């Protein structure tokens, strides 16, 4: 197909003008006195969200380069939300700042190379700083005090976070569903998650949130890498007949034929999901039989000789249910039996007592983790159903963020930190002047995020920002009481890894971005 | 179809225009501070690379003669990075540099083919130049620092190249291949490689790399020039009830039956691939039952009188896994029992023992060294998914490059040894004055790659070269850090082969662009 | 559909356009310093062809007059080559040449018919002075030496050619085919050549030389004019099933049934051709039995009244490999048994001898020399398979070159011989006045190739023009060399048939163009 190429100054403004529609669309939703945005549906009346991320999504250009920008600018920001579970408004308004200012040294005859290693560099000794600045979430209280501020005030919410972190672990999963009544319920069921996403994105479920949920599926096994249709419809016949839907856990699942069929022949029919089994080689095999074992199941291998062909009903496991997401597979409550797991649990522990690596210590110690840990489920009770979905909304982003803090500490929030770093780097210096200009544009657009919040609430953001700069420690401006005082004392918070993940994304847009010197796309 | 036909100077600039267009695309990756390139994909976000062979890829213009002056350049340009493993974007730049000078000479009235006989001469004493100054590479301790200077400086792939190049020779075959854990593994197995590419570039299996890749493939023997599928449905159908891979070794395979069906028929339902047998004549007969006794299967000869119909799987061939590319097929682990193998040997070293002609002992000799060799398989382990893959493509790339290093010893890079070569040739002289033009058309124009360097670091590209011109040996400018020195012993350094490979190539596409006076092109 | 004419001066001019586009697009590449054309393909990259018959087969204007003047001129052009093997690039420059300078004197009022008589009638009087300038060549050393300059200074090919023609006779048939190592193989075989050309051109096979090659075909012969599929349907499946191709040698092959299926039906399922029996009256049906008897079949006869449907496998003859073109049939190995042939070559013989008229003497000392003559089979052996296929080429062109100079003799090439016939003609005269124009224009146009010759080559038409029309004999001016001496002594040559079938058809062409006065074409 015919192709556009552009080379320079033309390219540039037309991904600093897709950037800019980007920007302006998401950015107004910023702060708590944040503005409304309407997307048009074509199924009815139009939705009203105050979310950036439905924004972000729903934005695309009808000019091709434009378009081409938003996306890019698009799809790396929304890493930040998919890794730190928040900052995609943030990680787009702090790459906007920065390109547009880059581009404009760039305008000047300014070394493209040398912007890029100054704004890196200006961004590491920020990134330094916030860890510096970082406050730690260890204890309890802290950590239900993290849960009922990202709760909004609910004290509840705070508590059963706090109840289900110290049951299982500050690294243990947890996990939330729907409850029975009005008491609120927690239990530690046996359970495995391990780090892998579906293979297509058409296998999205219902939930909107990016993941899939299973209602007492059946669990398949095999580390032959499955290629062709022919050789599992027994088995689909089979969980056909039985009704529930079906997990498919193979080495890897090509698009040939497996994949084609379950996306476009699949659209209803049944219920079918496919992930790539963890980790490679003899740890693959290994993670394959002990997933087998927890959820009562066999694995199909190909080096003793079974074949999938005649694998029946019993072969396959089973579970109450599945959650799978972009990149995390987990499994709440197997069928499998208890005894055989504390075998196997004890058998690896012997295994780790004999073995001659620490590589080899590491690994087994955290199979063993997995297996014996087990999976905490808490039960959303309320008055009435829809009060009892909104608390569970609720309690899900309070877990994400609770996580992400006693993961990486918490700072002040409303982009206050990011000002505090800037401010602490005012005196940074590069090898050559292009490189001191860089590390001065990522300087001035790292307080971006709180002009434009400072901005929504109608104040002049110059003023609160050049205040904000005069402060130390953790003073601020809180925008919703329009009062300046301690963050972290007045109830607004963020965790660290949020912006710190914003801001190193927001950084990699925009070298990537300045850096850019030719653009190809299909010809309109 | 209506056609549209162009002569002389409109044709010409048609030509520039469209080699300019695709030289402005390409070249702006060049050197260690290069810029990048984005493609749009209709799959979703756009990706930007910095690798000139995908941006020439996707390159394809609108206008008709552009476009095919655009297809010209690339297909040649294609041939050095096919023959060499490197040098698409150096061709391409010196390619366009020497075409739009001799165009300019051109249209001042000079002889075409008196400009095209100088720039052969230039360059002939150009490629005599370059192995005269190339600097040998036969040692282990030189393999292990090209093959660790190609890897960026990671001294284990050095090692891993030089352990294999010592264990199988500095003529065997060496692949790699996916590993199983921590440690890196190096063993000789029996195997196979013959130049033999595959038959249709619709064989592509998942990687992108221009190669296929089949597991446990069944490989099928016949010296008949298979033409109808009707001859082998049987087979056909057996591999597909085995469900294992399928590959063809037949004398050639026409694309009235069974190529159209194998590439459009087939697009998921099996895996086969077909591949012409090497050789012709007896010989063809020879290695067709040489490889037959390598992988333990049986060749369906006419002239015996057994047919393909009734061709079983007992007389297939089978292998561990075989990778077909634009020009190879190699057989990696065949699973043919030794002891014949070895018998099949001597009777080979007997046949060379009373062999009676020095063509007849050199044939023989290349049959007994391709059966007795094997093949060195090597693989990369590493912690985790990700960066195995990352060390396994970055050991391929080393391994190229070592190979065309020991192949044709090695030069400055960085485009030096080119500036080396033109600074040498300073009292080069043709027949008439023409060909003097020509002669320095070529030398002007072989500097380009280096000024281009220069100039994407953001100096100034006179001032380098002529500083560069001014030394002598291996003296030259590191762009990474604009320093000077000698590039051996600074770590930058390119194979001759490859610098030969590309120069030739250019200098091929200059003569036949400028020598070109008809266009014959379909109408819009 | 509505039709649009032109009568006179516009038709005229028309027509002159579409000649001069052609000739343009084609006579770049005359000389041995001819330019390159680029030819678009949609399948790929464009070729770059120095070939002007590939040239002239792609050319198809838009404009449907100039359309028309360019594909007469072309079709008969074509002819040229198909008579003689070399001469499409000169008969189109003299074409244009006269056809130009005629329709220039045609509008100055001049009558058409008598510039035509004119014409022709110095263009008669040329070919008598070149047989009359034709060096003979008919002893072996000659007949290498032609071979060898034929094939680009290679004593190899030249001693093949002469050996072949010693064992056969210059009358004889001869052939080459794919070696089978590296030694060069020539033996005669029993074979059978007859002037009959394939019925459609969409049978063309692989071979892009416009014939068509069958490995081991069947043969069928039967001299009713087969007109349905019903007839010969078993015959058909019996030939599928065997898998070998199929040869029809029928009395007419009509397009209803027959020719209709084997082309659209037929296009890979099975290989199949068709050809008209040759000769008429008894003698087609003494041609089909002595084919027959040949390669051992048997000739289906309504006369004696077996038919078709029950034609058995073992009826069919059957033969090593037939190769078929635009007017010759040969059966280069036929499986006839060897005894039979002796027997009624011995048969023939005896008729001869008591034979009572001089035609039937001839016809039957044809018939028996076609039968006992042979066929001569060329082995090309090489190194390698590219290097065996390109000499294999080169083979071909000698062998082609080599028969019309045994034929008609030889004289000085590089367009020399025109420019002498030209220079001896100077005192030619006609009836009236327009006569003498036409003589005049035919001689100032038959000095075309050499001026372009020249001019191809840089130099300057008319100085060289000028000094070689002041020679005598066989002196001109050589093109690669750039200086003057003896054409046969220094290797330039052309065989006179070419050139003298290059003049007629040229001459043909513009007698018929400059004749015309009304066009009629469809409708745009």
Redesign the interface.
Known sequence: ???D?K?GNDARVKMLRGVNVLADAVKVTLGPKGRNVVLDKSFGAPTITKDGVSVAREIELED?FEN?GA??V??VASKANDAAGDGTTTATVLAQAIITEGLKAVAAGM????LKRGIDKAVTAAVEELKALSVPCSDSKAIAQVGTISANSDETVGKLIAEAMDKVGKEGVITVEDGTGLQDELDVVEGMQFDRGYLSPYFINKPETGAVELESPFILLADK?I??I??MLPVLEAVAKAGKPLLIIAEDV?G??LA?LVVNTMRGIVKVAAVKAP?????RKAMLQDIATLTGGTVISEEIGMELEKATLEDLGQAKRVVINKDTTTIIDGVGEEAAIQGRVAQIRQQIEEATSD?DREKLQERVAKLAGGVAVIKVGAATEVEMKEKKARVEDALHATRAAVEEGVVAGGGVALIRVASKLADLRGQNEDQNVGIKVALRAMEAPLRQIVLNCGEEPSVVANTVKGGDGNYGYNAATEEYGNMIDMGILDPTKVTRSALQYAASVAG?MI?????????P
């Open positions: 197909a015919a192709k190429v080379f091709k081409m996306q890019m698009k799809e070394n493209p190379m040398d890498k290629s062709n022919r050789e090509e040939e034929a084609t980790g490679f080689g003899d740890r590589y990537l850096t850019t010197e030719c653009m190809v796309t299909d010809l």
